[PDB]
Amino acid sequence: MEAAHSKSTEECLAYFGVSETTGLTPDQVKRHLEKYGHNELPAEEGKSLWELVIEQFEDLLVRILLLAACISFVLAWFEEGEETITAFVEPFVILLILIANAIVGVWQERNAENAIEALKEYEPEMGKVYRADRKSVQRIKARDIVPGDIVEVAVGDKVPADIRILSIKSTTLRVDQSILTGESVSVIKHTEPVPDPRAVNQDKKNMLFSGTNIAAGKALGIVATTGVSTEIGKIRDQMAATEQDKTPLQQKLDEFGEQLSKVISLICVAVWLINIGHFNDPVHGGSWIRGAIYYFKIAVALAVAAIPEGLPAVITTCLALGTRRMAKKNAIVRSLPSVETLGCTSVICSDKTGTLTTNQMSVCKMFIIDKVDGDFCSLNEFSITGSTYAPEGEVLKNDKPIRSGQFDGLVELATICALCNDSSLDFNETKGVYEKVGEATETALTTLVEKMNVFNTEVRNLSKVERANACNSVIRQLMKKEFTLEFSRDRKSMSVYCSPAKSSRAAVGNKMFVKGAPEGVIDRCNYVRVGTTRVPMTGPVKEKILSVIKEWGTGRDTLRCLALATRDTPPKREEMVLDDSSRFMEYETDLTFVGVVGMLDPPRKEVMGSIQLCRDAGIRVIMITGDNKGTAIAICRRIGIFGENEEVADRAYTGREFDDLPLAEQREACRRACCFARVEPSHKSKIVEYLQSYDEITAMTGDGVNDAPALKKAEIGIAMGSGTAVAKTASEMVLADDNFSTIVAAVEEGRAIYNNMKQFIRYLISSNVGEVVCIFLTAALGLPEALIPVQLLWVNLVTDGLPATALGFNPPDLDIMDRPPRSPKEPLISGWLFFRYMAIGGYVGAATVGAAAWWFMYAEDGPGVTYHQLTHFMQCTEDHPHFEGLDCEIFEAPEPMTMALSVLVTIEMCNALNSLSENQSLMRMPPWVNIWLLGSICLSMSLHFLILYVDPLPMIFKLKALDLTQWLMVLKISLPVIGLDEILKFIARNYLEG
Amino acid sequence: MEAAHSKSTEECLAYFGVSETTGLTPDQVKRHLEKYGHNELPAEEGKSLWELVIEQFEDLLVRILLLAACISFVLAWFEEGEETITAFVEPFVILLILIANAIVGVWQERNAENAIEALKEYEPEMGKVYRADRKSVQRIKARDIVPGDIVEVAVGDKVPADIRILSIKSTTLRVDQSILTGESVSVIKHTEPVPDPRAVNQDKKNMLFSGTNIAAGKALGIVATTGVSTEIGKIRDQMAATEQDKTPLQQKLDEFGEQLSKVISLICVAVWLINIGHFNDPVHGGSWIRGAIYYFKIAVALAVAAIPEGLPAVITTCLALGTRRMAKKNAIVRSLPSVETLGCTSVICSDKTGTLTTNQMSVCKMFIIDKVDGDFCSLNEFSITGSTYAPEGEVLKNDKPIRSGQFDGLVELATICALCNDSSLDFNETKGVYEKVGEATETALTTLVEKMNVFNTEVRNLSKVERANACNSVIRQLMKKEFTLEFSRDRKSMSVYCSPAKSSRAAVGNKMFVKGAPEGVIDRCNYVRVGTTRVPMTGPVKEKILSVIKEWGTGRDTLRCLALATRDTPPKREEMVLDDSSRFMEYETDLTFVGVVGMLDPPRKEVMGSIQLCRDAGIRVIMITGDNKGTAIAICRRIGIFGENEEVADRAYTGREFDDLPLAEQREACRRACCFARVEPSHKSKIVEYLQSYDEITAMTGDGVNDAPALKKAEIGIAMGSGTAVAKTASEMVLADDNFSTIVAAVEEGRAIYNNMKQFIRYLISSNVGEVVCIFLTAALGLPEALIPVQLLWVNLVTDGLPATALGFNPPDLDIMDRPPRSPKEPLISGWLFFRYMAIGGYVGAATVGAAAWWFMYAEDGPGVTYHQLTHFMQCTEDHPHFEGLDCEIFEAPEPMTMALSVLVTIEMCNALNSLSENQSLMRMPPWVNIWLLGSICLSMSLHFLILYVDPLPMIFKLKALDLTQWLMVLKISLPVIGLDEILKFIARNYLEG
Numbered sequence A, B: 001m002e003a004a005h006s007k008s009t010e011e012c013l014a015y016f017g018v019s020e021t022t023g024l025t026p027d028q029v030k031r032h033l034e035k036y037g038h039n040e041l042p043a044e045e046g047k048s049l050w051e052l053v054i055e056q057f058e059d060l061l062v063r064i065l066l067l068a069a070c071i072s073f074v075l076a077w078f079e080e081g082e083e084t085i086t087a088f089v090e091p092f093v094i095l096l097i098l099i100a101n102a103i104v105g106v107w108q109e110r111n112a113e114n115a116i117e118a119l120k121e122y123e124p125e126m127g128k129v130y131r132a133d134r135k136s137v138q139r140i141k142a143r144d145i146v147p148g149d150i151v152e153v154a155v156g157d158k159v160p161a162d163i164r165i166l167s168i169k170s171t172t173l174r175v176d177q178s179i180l181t182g183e184s185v186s187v188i189k190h191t192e193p194v195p196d197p198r199a200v201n202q203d204k205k206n207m208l209f210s211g212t213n214i215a216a217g218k219a220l221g222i223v224a225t226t227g228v229s230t231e232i233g234k235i236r237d238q239m240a241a242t243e244q245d246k247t248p249l250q251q252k253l254d255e256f257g258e259q260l261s262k263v264i265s266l267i268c269v270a271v272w273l274i275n276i277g278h279f280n281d282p283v284h285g286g287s288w289i290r291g292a293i294y295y296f297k298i299a300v301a302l303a304v305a306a307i308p309e310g311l312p313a314v315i316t317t318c319l320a321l322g323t324r325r326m327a328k329k330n331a332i333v334r335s336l337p338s339v340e341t342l343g344c345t346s347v348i349c350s351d352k353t354g355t356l357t358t359n360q361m362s363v364c365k366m367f368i369i370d371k372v373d374g375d376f377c378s379l380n381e382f383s384i385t386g387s388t389y390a391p392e393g394e395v396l397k398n399d400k401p402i403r404s405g406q407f408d409g410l411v412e413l414a415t416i417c418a419l420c421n422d423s424s425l426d427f428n429e430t431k432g433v434y435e436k437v438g439e440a441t442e443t444a445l446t447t448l449v450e451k452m453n454v455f456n457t458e459v460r461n462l463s464k465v466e467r468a469n470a471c472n473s474v475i476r477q478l479m480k481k482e483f484t485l486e487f488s489r490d491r492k493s494m495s496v497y498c499s500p501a502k503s504s505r506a507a508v509g510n511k512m513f514v515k516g517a518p519e520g521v522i523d524r525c526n527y528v529r530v531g532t533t534r535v536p537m538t539g540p541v542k543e544k545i546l547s548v549i550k551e552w553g554t555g556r557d558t559l560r561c562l563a564l565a566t567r568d569t570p571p572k573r574e575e576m577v578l579d580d581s582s583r584f585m586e587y588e589t590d591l592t593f594v595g596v597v598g599m600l601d602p603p604r605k606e607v608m609g610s611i612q613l614c615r616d617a618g619i620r621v622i623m624i625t626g627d628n629k630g631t632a633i634a635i636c637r638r639i640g641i642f643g644e645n646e647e648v649a650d651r652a653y654t655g656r657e658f659d660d661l662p663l664a665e666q667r668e669a670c671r672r673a674c675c676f677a678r679v680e681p682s683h684k685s686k687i688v689e690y691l692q693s694y695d696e697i698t699a700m701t702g703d704g705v706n707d708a709p710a711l712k713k714a715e716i717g718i719a720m721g722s723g724t725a726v727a728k729t730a731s732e733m734v735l736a737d738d739n740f741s742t743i744v745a746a747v748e749e750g751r752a753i754y755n756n757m758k759q760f761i762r763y764l765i766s767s768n769v770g771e772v773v774c775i776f777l778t779a780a781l782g783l784p785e786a787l788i789p790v791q792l793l794w795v796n797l798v799t800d801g802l803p804a805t806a807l808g809f810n811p812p813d814l815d816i817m818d819r820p821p822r823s824p825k826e827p828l829i830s831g832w833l834f835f836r837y838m839a840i841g842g843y844v845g846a847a848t849v850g851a852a853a854w855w856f857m858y859a860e861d862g863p864g865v866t867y868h869q870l871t872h873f874m875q876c877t878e879d880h881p882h883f884e885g886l887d888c889e890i891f892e893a894p895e896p897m898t899m900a901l902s903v904l905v906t907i908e909m910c911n912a913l914n915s916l917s918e919n920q921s922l923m924r925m926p927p928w929v930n931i932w933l934l935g936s937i938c939l940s941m942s943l944h945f946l947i948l949y950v951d952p953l954p955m956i957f958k959l960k961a962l963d964l965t966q967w968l969m970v971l972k973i974s975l976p977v978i979g980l981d982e983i984l985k986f987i988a989r990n991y992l993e994g
């Protein structure tokens, strides 16, 4: 099909030869599948094959080093004779460390996307359609939909393909197509054709586009185009871009990155200044131009050696790692930030029905009026069996099976349940079980009437597929549904207008069948039905009705109740304006009470514990629901939000009560109350907002469209896998598994990701500081050069490389989930931390000069012995008195440097073992806890010993192998770094906190 | 200059304005240096920058794998859907192992060349020239030579630059220019000009080319062109190629390489056959075309996994390593083969003077006749002091200084020493010491006459440079040297024809001054001089002369003696034909004995011990010399070839005696005698040849041109750094240091290089055999596939990679130099070794299937348990009776394979620790003896664990991580391999040999 919007409903039906009531024929479906293919887009597998790489080279930090590489390379072509080699290496020593991370990053990034792309591929999308195959609407894989068969869609649904609306089954049909037309607000639809054949999507008010969601109403329509031919299948990634952005934790880490950049840039040009008097030295001999370039090169080298190059990548790796960890737990992270944000979560507002509960409804109790004797009132309670949606169960009166049809009140009760109901039931031949089609609460009523079989219909001689709606169909034949006043949360009810079909009930007139929240309906009832008679509603009757609702509500089964009534004398079909659902409550008045039903909706098993763990991590869990406060509190006690016998008269409200409080008190009640009932979708959001006026990190968990607002308002929205699409769209994460627990685990990961980020910045700084206080302490005490360009670049590639990145793989502390959430305002780096940095950064920098000196001084069997004369080292050229006579060129020996460069590397590797935690002992948290860290160290070490024992290298690096004794001197001066930190930890642990 | 050959001697002198007697002026030299630069070629530093790499890819073996990579890559583009990844990896897994060696090889190769190129650069070449600067010929760095100054050259010398012969100072001047004209035989030169301006080098019989050596005679000439303008400086590597060849050990290893290639190629196509019935299996499902390609791929995989790819490189690395080790000991290896060959050395024929001794001559004793009273004869012995060439010492008679000039006989003795002498003395201002110019024996005589000062010449008022030849010059003024009958080893003497200058001695006639080996000269003496008188030679006089020669000869000082005589009435200058030196002995007849001189030439200090160590290694050391048998045996006792009081009457010969023996006895005496004296250069070679008729590996060590033949004939020639160029040219190695010991060390290295080669072939085969007996034992017992293509290629890259190459770095056994040399005929692989191979190769191959089965069977907490049912594994598809019911697809689990592939890798690494020796216990020779091997293992292991724990990998490699318990199962079945070999070693060690 094409330009389907231009033609009319008949033309479209005509064009495909289909009855909008029957649907395609199994044969037609077979053919169309061949003529149009499956309703699916080309597998958009993990792309960005090369882009990912180039992405690694974007941050400022990596740019700098990437620039230094060019400089070091230009100076290479301008370096002559005897050391051109040691010049062409420097750049590659910078380029390498950079490339080593570009891979770990692009690799982690790859695995992430895949795991996620694989979790989506899991549970296939379904669609509701009408086909000759069956009389009732059936479910099917969305990919099997073909242009032609009749499709049904309702509030909350994801439009499966481009549909030409044929009929609107409600007063209004609003749609959310921002994903296409870009317009945020939900647009209204109609069936009227749009004549302009070249009209824009925003003008086709009689079309529904694949990918958009139904914001309101219900509608039936004919599929115009599917697969790639869809309005959105064309604007696909293959023919349209997308969008990106940087996480908040990253916004704070880039602000910190540059902050370091500036500092580093200063303490570097400072070196170039504190050495202007050396441009004219024998070591250079050449002009001040040749002597400057050297110290200039040392500056850049110190820069590179200081810049935390792996920060921009370690963050990407931790995030990707988080994403991947969630996927392994069946959680789709629609936004990287999510994981981090969930760590600072203090409050988690969760929806009840469908979220904290399973939303597998089943009417197991119900009653109608028996006798009304003035002051005395009796009810006719019943019990129904069968917990699933299967139409297999018995109606019991006093524990004994009875013919529901026997009771008049029960016949009406079923008439209402069947008629004022927008859902249905469909048997899944494959799984061999009846699945619902529509809302569980409504479907529960559908199976109910199937069980009651009030008109004693032959059901034994029927198939699984036919037994599903049989009884229901029968009742649909007795009355004609003129129209329905769709359910709306302000009214808390739904209605349906009916006219008698034949002349059996014709002598009675039109009727309106209502059902909604007990409180609302029972109040708009002036009559209570008794059998087939009617009597006025009285105090005593109202009394009985509610008391039993209360009983069932807060009972052991915490039943979700629904009232049913009828408008014996509805308004004149004309006097009613379906313009706005606000006028409907009036039409549902002067009603006659019929009966009540109670269904069970078991809370999810994993929820109780999750709430406990949430408590341990000092995270609050508030329940928000449209349901009854009684049953709402009941379930709260059942899941652990409330103690079995805890007084909650002050920690539980109903939107009514809440609104009754003055503004200031509402806000206040939000940080006190843990349960809100009979609350509207605007109240959910508001509650979340109040919780945010206290600068807290709020999470929202829901499944319905009445959770859309809240899920958006929150910092992080988590939606149920089996929930509406409209809820998923407004969520940062999706529990495909529907496992509530995963939310907890998502917080731990968020907490660990932050911790690792710290341990990394802690390592890189407490180490790189020594690499500076080593260059200045020497230019202060007067000692000779301790390191050269290539030398620095090397310590960098070995201390700021993989060993640092592997820090992003550090396990969470043994108590990361037993400490309250971190304030969103808490500073990235605490004062005590900066101390930790200078404390270590100072020792390591001094532990290096003390090594270069040690050789010169206390060198036992070590050559070149002397004492304190090092300060005046360029003076043996003219004035060498005390000088024993040892070559006046011993102040340029590789022995000293190579003796320090090793302590440096070595001590830094030791410092890495201190980054396995922040306050935990290296004895409580063994170094072997992060195998990836060890392997990173061993590799780093090996890579160093290699630079010392492979003939060509030691020369290029102006180094000289160390004695099997001099090394022990390093393991002597470096190893103690563990203690300095181990002790500081004991302080922040036992002294400060704890 | 140019076309210098076309012009005459005068024209050439004219062209540069130089006197062939004076030489260039310090000023002229300064200018010419600027106008022509230094006599040197462009620094031909280590080249072959890229060629070295491509060289790694030449051998057959690496070619094969290089082919498999192409195949595996072609099949990659033709593999579809679900495992294209596991297909594109295979090739890179082959390419990697190849590249990993190409580097270790090209790297080792690089270091080698450099070390050598650096050892050559060490001691600068010198040249003999005449310059106004000084009256006597002086020494100078050859690079300072400029076209123009007069240069001198003599037998043994290396021509410093392109010289235009000006004057031949001998009857003949033969030159060796093969290096240029290519003609092997030594060509005769002349002074006659060659008119053809475009003549070829082979026609310029009046030129000497830089780079060639003087085969005979002496000559003075003018430098025509130097530096790059030389006839050889043009044909340089930059404008001309070179040559190569493969070592014998390599010729035997390539014969063995292909031998394996054929076998491997068979046991591979065999696999492809023993699996034709599987091309039609469910595992493939596809046609026999799809099923074949698989088993075809497994074949190639087994091939690659079997081929010893690192053999062609490990050999190159050991050799290069040898070369490098020798350089570190100041030994220039002019041929890689050398080091290996020196290991099989059984006999080392070494020259005495200059080789076993220092050749720093100094006349410290001398005598002339005192009185001849018929039957009584007395001598006038003297003693001279001063061991160096400095003209500082005293002549003592009865321990008291005397005026040599006092004795007439001593005046003649000095006349002769000064006149019949081709060498001179030159003072080196820099080193501040007198250096010889010419042969040490002759120069010894030069310093001698300086000491005697027979004409009492004012020497006190002279400079160091002038004091050098003063007295000598004076005597040169008394007689005119008409011509000289150059020394020739058949005669064992030298002669000079002189005429009186003025009319002081004119009333006597012409004279001939002879000096040579005592035996020869004394026999051609009919008169003995007494003072200025002459008396006939008698028995008694002959008796005294020789007895004292004997005394001095075999004395504590083992003095090298020389006789001096004169021909009072020489033949008529015309009656003499200088055509051939064979006619000279006649001219030196009817002589008058004058006196004898004895010089000391101290044996090198390091020689004695070296001979001992040579003995321990069961290597013989024979001394060959032209010198006197008495003093020859004397020195032999002194250095250890002979015991202080050992009877050698049967182990010492003189070329005369030797020739007296019948052929069969000469040959025999060669394997018995350890000392040959008064032997000619033809005898040296012959001796070496006889030693080779016994299929032994003979080494020749020399310094003179009389060693050229022998050094060539031998298997390996070793020349002294301070020896002639003609000797160096005919040598495979050069002891720049002159350290005799290095020869010993060169043998150890030769022995170790072979050993390592064995340990490598031993490892690669005893291991790769398991990788075959693992594939067949499974296709025999019926068990399921144990490995796949990518799986094999992996075991290869990790067991046949660096861990194998590092085997070329294995230290020598603790007794490699205490075992006799290996027979040249000994088979590369002994029978007992092939056993060792199958013994291990079998267990490892069976220890793999027993692991893949173990999981399937005795798997404790390990899943997929069963019993013996494995044989019938493709039958649960139709007939599964006893089958407990466990999935009929458990026979395709990764658990089993990944459980074996680990044992394989693991057990092979353990096998590497068995290759640290052949018979020594892993307890005597710790595994940590070869750090390079350990590091290779750790890397290999790490690289494996990585393929198991990095999510993407285990999938690509169809593997699945092992339990922290299943691994212990590997360390249980693999670790015992150490014992199998440890025990076999105990056998070949204690049982077999030992």
Ligand SMILES: Nc1ncnc2c1ncn2[C@@H]1O[C@H](COP(=O)(O)OP(=O)(O)CP(=O)(O)O)[C@@H](O)[C@H]1O
Binding pocket: A351, A352, A353, A354, A439, A441, A442, A487, A489, A492, A493, A494, A515, A516, A517, A518, A561, A562, A624, A625, A626, A627, A628, A679, A680, A704, A706
């Ligand atoms: N289709 C329908 N027709 C009539 N009444 C309905 C209805 N669906 C729900 N209701 C009633 O209206 C009250 C509120 O609906 P609302 O959607 O706000 O809350 P909820 O109880 O359905 C789900 P949650 O627990 O997720 O908030 C319900 O609790 C129920 O009693």
Ligand SMILES: [Ca+2]
Binding pocket: A304, A305, A306, A307, A308, A309, A796, A800
């Ligand atoms: Ca850095």
Ligand SMILES: [Ca+2]
Binding pocket: A305, A764, A767, A768, A771, A795, A796, A799, A800, A908
């Ligand atoms: Ca660092």
Ligand SMILES: [Ca+2]
Binding pocket: B304, B305, B306, B307, B308, B309, B796, B800
């Ligand atoms: Ca191999």
Ligand SMILES: [Ca+2]
Binding pocket: B305, B764, B767, B768, B771, B795, B796, B799, B800, B908
């Ligand atoms: Ca192997």
Ligand SMILES: [Mg+2]
Binding pocket: A351, A352, A353, A354, A355, A702, A703, A704
């Ligand atoms: Mg809900």
Ligand SMILES: [Mg+2]
Binding pocket: B351, B352, B353, B354, B355, B702, B703, B704
């Ligand atoms: Mg000699």
